[PDB]
Amino acid sequence: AKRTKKVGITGKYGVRYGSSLRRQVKKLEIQQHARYDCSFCGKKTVKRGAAGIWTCSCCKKTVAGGAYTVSTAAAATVRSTIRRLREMVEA
Amino acid sequence: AREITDIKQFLELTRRADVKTATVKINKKLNKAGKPFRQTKFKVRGSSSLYTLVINDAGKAKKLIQSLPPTLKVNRL
Amino acid sequence: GRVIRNQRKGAGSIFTSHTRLRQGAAKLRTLDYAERHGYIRGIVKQIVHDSGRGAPLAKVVFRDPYKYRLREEIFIANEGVHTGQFIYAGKKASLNVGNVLPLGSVPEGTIVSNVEEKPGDRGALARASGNYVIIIGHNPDENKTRVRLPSGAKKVISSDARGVIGVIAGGGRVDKPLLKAGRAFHKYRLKRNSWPKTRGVAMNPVDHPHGGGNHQHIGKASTISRGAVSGQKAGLIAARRTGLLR
Amino acid sequence: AQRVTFRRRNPYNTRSNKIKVVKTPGGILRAQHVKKLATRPKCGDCGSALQGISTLRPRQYATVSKTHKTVSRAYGGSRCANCVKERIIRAFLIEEQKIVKKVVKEQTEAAK
Amino acid sequence: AKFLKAGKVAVVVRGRYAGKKVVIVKPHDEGSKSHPFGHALVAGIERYPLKVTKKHGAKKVAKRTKIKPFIKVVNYNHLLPTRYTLDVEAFKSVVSTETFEQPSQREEAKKVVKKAFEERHQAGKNQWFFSKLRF
Amino acid sequence: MRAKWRKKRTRRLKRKRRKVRA
RNA sequence: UCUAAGGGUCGGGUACGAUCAACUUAGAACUGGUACGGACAAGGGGAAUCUGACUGUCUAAUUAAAACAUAGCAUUGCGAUGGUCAGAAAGUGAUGUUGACGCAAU
RNA sequence: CUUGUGACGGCCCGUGAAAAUCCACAGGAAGGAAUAGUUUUCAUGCCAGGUCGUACUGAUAACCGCAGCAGGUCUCCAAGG
RNA sequence: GAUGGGGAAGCUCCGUUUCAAAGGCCUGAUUUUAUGCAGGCCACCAUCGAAAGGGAAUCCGGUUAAGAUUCCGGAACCUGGAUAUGGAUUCUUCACGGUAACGUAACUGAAUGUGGAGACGUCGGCGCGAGCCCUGGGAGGAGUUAUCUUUUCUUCUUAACA
Ligand SMILES: [Mg+2]
Ligand SMILES: [Mg+2]
Ligand SMILES: [Mg+2]
Ligand SMILES: [Zn+2]
Ligand SMILES: [Zn+2]
């Protein structure tokens, strides 16, 4: 059964700390504790070890990523513009 | 502190030129509920190990008893 | 009056940084001959967590070109570097994330990190998690490059300074609320003894300029001159303006 | 329901002060200090435990023979079998890659 | 087409002779009773000959040009076939399926395989086969 | 060990070859 | 004084039977000077106001609080030839095994 | 019940010592047999292991509180209902 | 916390690898011989700092008025050094077997390099082991017994090391 209506993983915090702070903490802990797709072995086995460290349980690779998600949007647009500049530098 | 399970290796062990002392132990053992037999243990004192040979037959046991060398100081108990 | 707390911090008795569980200074590889005439290839062996630091570190192994042995450098890990990745350091290195190109050989709009100020100090700029340096322009004659720093400042440094291409991993950390004095305790427990902070207005006048009074109030203005002396600089030092702008 | 005591002068429950209660041939209970357990040797590449290698404290490896410390392969007591296999594969394949790369790069500039 | 022929050279990837170069003299695609898998009857070098320079005069040369061979049945999954090849005529008749399970016959086959490998090595033949795969 | 052990090994071999020299 | 439910291990050509061992729950009669968590052990509760968000801390030996701290919010300084602080001086130091998602001051 | 351990799982903006010491691998320097050697990581056999502490209490009487002071002072073992 | 250095009128202060010409390591070669000269290798760079951290190796029984993992009897183990015999290996000189994971009594390996162990949080549940607790039969001893109780209590143990 759905035990909580809206608090989810922040149900461990009780009534403390304020609802709007618990909302942000919920949104970041879901990303923090979710599993992700491994870009090398192709499985849903990537988990966070520490802040910025994302290791795959199957193929034992370890990728440096964001603090609570495996890849941040800033890193995505940086990787895109590095790829674009690398194609431009021969042209 | 070692078990020896071979008669000829026991004989070549008893003449190892560091062996001085042996002890022959008689025990009353019960292999089954109806058969009290006698067990003999031949304990040879080497320089770093005590070697025990366990014989469950009295004829073989006494045959080893005359097979012991005469220079070996034996203890009957 | 007494000697105040920020005045006492400089003796370094109990205010030294707690460095027991740290894995070494995260510096770039030294600029010997290979890095300024060609490149060199190393390997990422492991990405590890550094105590008291928000970003992960990378243990990169190179071969010593002059002796049969292996050198192990500690890099600050860029976001996207994985274990087993080949890292290329040098003047002729290709422009990929993790490579250690000098700033004279990258085009406009490149995002780098762990940037040397002068060529050879092995990393000074944009080293905290999520920070980066953008190359704003080149100047071949009187060979300098303009860069945009994480503070928004624009520096003009040498084009022989090196930088690791990409952004520092572990970004977005400070967006999560700590929620707890225990969490702040465990955060500063591995950095240094600067927490908790007693307000100086809650002290006695022997202990702080702000202390004393029958109500908790500052008294004089809290903006302090730059020419003030030690024991006076408690407040907003050399503030050009104050208040919340809209 | 006998109760035991430490047999050494350390009265604290440290990691090197672990005891186990045994029953002596005198019929009494007595503490017996046990040494710390050994961890298995690990592979240099994959980091998993090496199979076929004895597990001892590091000074005890000087007492056992070579058979207890090695396997009968190249990188025997040092790397895992699959790690040795994949580095053999990697070695042969990329020396072949270097041969093909060398002949193509000489051929293109010999033509031009 | 199939390539695992009776003259190929491969690299063993498993067992006591891992990383050693062997020459296949007898393939068996549909296995046997004692070996129910696709296997071969390879012969190879256990101890490679060492490097020879101008400084060694004939005594160190005879010392360093020794080859210790072996004969072995290996699964196809434990072999890595290569692009090179090696001629077999001198010992394909003396290593076979019944020359195993008999240590005297293994000794006698290893002697003539050693003689063939030393004459091919003292001739300028198969430098890749007689070199050591360094890994 | 391995260092004092190799030194003891070479000492034993050196002593043995010195006495079989005679 | 009873009833019911909750198991293990052996046994089947190419549905069950035997044996063994657990304290858990529910129910029913009967009974007593209506007693039965029989000693021990063991929450008083509700309606509101003021105040501090909470957990935490302090005046050892008259004040434990509404005081302090706290997370949250905001301001200030600083790109290393630097900010803040130390030292009688120094080829001297702390932050700094640091670099603005940082350090320092409120 | 106490304790040891194994495989796991949760937590972290906390990911939770160092060195002495020991072993293995890669490498192939050098030494090597045939009437003989080479090996003491196999077995057996020989000799030696110095210096200082070691009793007892550890607390309503062996410590500290002017004392044989209801105070203070770290820890291990732990039967039946 | 010395040294090299640099301050300080100075008692002394800074600093601990620094603006230092900072040393020792094995093979041997020589057998006037002592240990120089043949060589070759290596660059940390004092030292102090834990009777709870790391760490070579010992257990049982007995014994005193008072000591014991220390004494006695028995049985082990480690380190350092001497060394011979057996076994192993070799005329294919430096082992064989198994497809393999790997196995064995052994089964050369200098310089140099690499790897492992040392070497590691806390909590929760589950599995296994040891000791204790509970309990049945049997062999002994003691207790209660007007009545009742095949009953109540107690002994029945196995160390290190191989
Ligand atoms: Mg503090
Ligand atoms: Mg005031
Ligand atoms: Mg083995
Ligand atoms: Zn994967
Ligand atoms: Zn492996």
From Swiss-Prot, chain A:
UniProt GO BP: cytoplasmic translation
Chain positions with Phosphoserine modification: S39
Main location: cytoplasm
InterPro entries listed in its UniProt record: Ribosomal_eL37/eL43, Ribosomal_eL43, Ribosomal_protein_eL43, Ribosomal_zn-bd
Membrane-spanning segments: none
GO molecular function, a single term: structural constituent of ribosome
Keyword Cell division (UniProt): no
GO cellular component terms listed in the entry, alphabetical order: cytosol; cytosolic large ribosomal subunit
Pfam families: Ribosomal_L37ae (PF01780)
Zinc finger C4-type: from-to: 38-59
Localization: Cytoplasm
Keyword Phosphoprotein assigned: yes
Key words, A-Z: Cytoplasm, Metal-binding, Phosphoprotein, Ribonucleoprotein, Ribosomal protein, Zinc, Zinc-finger
Signal sequence extent: none
Miscellaneous comment in the UniProt entry for this protein: Present with 44600 molecules/cell in log phase SD medium.
PANTHER family, per the entry: 60S RIBOSOMAL PROTEIN L37A (PTHR48129), LARGE RIBOSOMAL SUBUNIT PROTEIN EL43 (PTHR48129:SF1)
Subunit details: Component of the large ribosomal subunit (LSU). Mature yeast ribosomes consist of a small (40S) and a large (60S) subunit. The 40S small subunit contains 1 molecule of ribosomal RNA (18S rRNA) and 33 different proteins (encoded by 57 genes). The large 60S subunit contains 3 rRNA molecules (25S, 5.8S and 5S rRNA) and 46 different proteins (encoded by 81 genes).
UniProt-listed NCBIfam families: eL43_euk_arch, PRK03976.1
Family label: Belongs to the eukaryotic ribosomal protein eL43 family.
Protein name (record): Large ribosomal subunit protein eL43A
From Swiss-Prot, chain B:
Domain of life: Eukaryota
Principal localisation: cytoplasm
GO BP annotations, alphabetical order: cytoplasmic translation; protein-RNA complex assembly
Gene Ontology molecular function: any one: structural constituent of ribosome
One Pfam family this sequence matches: Ribosomal_L38e
Keyword check for Cytoplasm: yes
Family that this chain belongs to: Belongs to the eukaryotic ribosomal protein eL38 family.
Functional note: Component of the ribosome, a large ribonucleoprotein complex responsible for the synthesis of proteins in the cell. The small ribosomal subunit (SSU) binds messenger RNAs (mRNAs) and translates the encoded message by selecting cognate aminoacyl-transfer RNA (tRNA) molecules. The large subunit (LSU) contains the ribosomal catalytic site termed the peptidyl transferase center (PTC), which catalyzes the formation of peptide bonds, thereby polymerizing the amino acids delivered by tRNAs into a polypeptide chain.
Miscellaneous field: Present with 50200 molecules/cell in log phase SD medium.
Subunit description: Component of the large ribosomal subunit (LSU). Mature yeast ribosomes consist of a small (40S) and a large (60S) subunit. The 40S small subunit contains 1 molecule of ribosomal RNA (18S rRNA) and 33 different proteins (encoded by 57 genes). The large 60S subunit contains 3 rRNA molecules (25S, 5.8S and 5S rRNA) and 46 different proteins (encoded by 81 genes).
Name this protein carries in UniProt: Large ribosomal subunit protein eL38
Higher taxonomy: Eukaryota, Fungi, Dikarya, Ascomycota, Saccharomycotina
Gene behind the chain: RPL38
Curated annotation (Swiss-Prot), chain C:
Any one GO biological process: cytoplasmic translation
Keywords from the UniProt entry: Cytoplasm, Isopeptide bond, Phosphoprotein, Ribonucleoprotein, Ribosomal protein, RNA-binding, rRNA-binding, Ubl conjugation
Residues with the Phosphoserine modification: S51, S94, S158, S159
Record SMART domains: Ribosomal_L2, Ribosomal_L2_C
CC per GO annotation: cytosol; cytosolic large ribosomal subunit
Crosslink site: Glycyl lysine isopeptide (Lys-Gly) (interchain with G-Cter in ubiquitin): K45, K92, K118, K144
Keyword Ribosomal protein: yes
InterPro entries: NA-bd_OB-fold, Rib_uL2_dom2, Ribosomal_uL2, Ribosomal_uL2_C, Ribosomal_uL2_CS, Ribosomal_uL2_dom3, Ribosomal_uL2_RNA-bd_dom, Translation_prot_SH3-like_sf
SUPFAM superfamilies the record matches: Nucleic acid-binding proteins, Translation proteins SH3-like domain
Subunit structure: Component of the large ribosomal subunit (LSU). Mature yeast ribosomes consist of a small (40S) and a large (60S) subunit. The 40S small subunit contains 1 molecule of ribosomal RNA (18S rRNA) and 33 different proteins (encoded by 57 genes). The large 60S subunit contains 3 rRNA molecules (25S, 5.8S and 5S rRNA) and 46 different proteins (encoded by 81 genes).
Family membership noted in the UniProt record: Belongs to the universal ribosomal protein uL2 family.
Protein name: Large ribosomal subunit protein uL2A
Gene name of the record: RPL2A
From Swiss-Prot, chain E:
PROSITE patterns from the UniProt entry: RIBOSOMAL_L27E
One GO biological process term: cytoplasmic translation
Keywords recorded for this protein, A-Z: Cytoplasm, Ribonucleoprotein, Ribosomal protein
Subcellular location as annotated: Cytoplasm
Chief location: cytoplasm
InterPro entries according to UniProt: Ribosomal_eL27 (IPR001141), Ribosomal_eL27_CS (IPR018262), Ribosomal_eL27_KOW (IPR041991), Ribosomal_eL27_sf (IPR038655), Translation_prot_SH3-like_sf (IPR008991)
Recorded GO CC terms: cytosol; cytosolic large ribosomal subunit
GO molecular function terms noted in the UniProt entry: structural constituent of ribosome
Pfam families reported for this sequence: Ribosomal_L27e (PF01777)
Subunit organization: Component of the large ribosomal subunit (LSU). Mature yeast ribosomes consist of a small (40S) and a large (60S) subunit. The 40S small subunit contains 1 molecule of ribosomal RNA (18S rRNA) and 33 different proteins (encoded by 57 genes). The large 60S subunit contains 3 rRNA molecules (25S, 5.8S and 5S rRNA) and 46 different proteins (encoded by 81 genes).
Family classification: Belongs to the eukaryotic ribosomal protein eL27 family.
Note: Present with 7380 molecules/cell in log phase SD medium.
Protein name (database record): Large ribosomal subunit protein eL27A
Organism: Saccharomyces cerevisiae (strain ATCC 204508 / S288c) (Baker's yeast)
Lineage, broadest ranks: Eukaryota, Fungi, Dikarya, Ascomycota, Saccharomycotina
